């Protein structure tokens, strides 16, 4: 076991799902939870409520580490991004800093074709 001050939490917010993972600052995984794993299937999985419950599940799953003064980084355009940080605060974790990062390609390569619906 270990007690980690200044651990890093990763938020990946797809349109269809949300993933929460806790790693040491060098990216070594400590614990992870998910909306789909929270007892959700299909369209329910994109709701911000699902993200909140997923964040609580992640926090509880990793309690055995003495994690304090958390840092949170968020990626993706999906919904419920803010809800996860609210959850980690509510879980009791102390949050020092918060950052956004999402890959931009600088016109790298071709995306799929437009959707006629």
Partner RNA sequence: GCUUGAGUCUCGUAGAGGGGGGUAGAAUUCCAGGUGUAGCGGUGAAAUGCGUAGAGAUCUGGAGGAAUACCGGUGGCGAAG
Q: Which residues contact RNA (rule: CB under 7 A)? A: 10, 12, 14-17, 19, 21, 23-24, 26-32, 34-37, 41-43, 45, 75, 103-109, 117
Question: Least Å distance between CB 79 and RNA?
Answer: 13
* C-beta closer to RNA: residue 24 or 86: 24
Question: Least Å distance between CB 76 and RNA?
Answer: 8
Question: Least Å distance between CB 12 and RNA?
Answer: 5
* C-beta closer to RNA: residue 35 or 87: 35
Give the phi and the psi of residue 90 in degrees, each rounded to 5: -65, -35
Minimal CA–CA distance to 9: which of 82, 85, 64, 91? 85
Give the phi and the psi of residue 87 in degrees, each rounded to 5: -65, -50
- Interatomic CA distance for residues 93 and 82, integer angstroms: 15
- Interatomic CA distance for residues 2 and 62, integer angstroms: 11
CB-CB contact of 1 with 65 (8 Å): yes
* C-beta closer to RNA: residue 61 or 91: 61
* C-beta closer to RNA: residue 106 or 114: 106
């Amino acid at each position: 076991r270990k007690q980690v001050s200044d651990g890093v939490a990763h938020i990946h917010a797809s349109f269809n799902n949300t993933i929460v993972t806790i790693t040491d600052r060098q990216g070594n995984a400590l614990g992870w939870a998910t909306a789909g794993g929270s007892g959700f299937r299909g369209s329910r999985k994109s709701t911000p409520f699902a993200a909140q419950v997923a964040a609580e599940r992640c926090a509880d799953a990793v309690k055995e580490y003495g994690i304090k003064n958390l840092e949170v980084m968020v990626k993706g355009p999906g919904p419920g991004r803010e809800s996860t940080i609210r959850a980690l605060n509510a879980a009791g974790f102390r949050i020092t800093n918060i950052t956004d990062v999402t890959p931009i390609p600088h016109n790298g390569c071709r995306p799929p074709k437009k959707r006629r619906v």
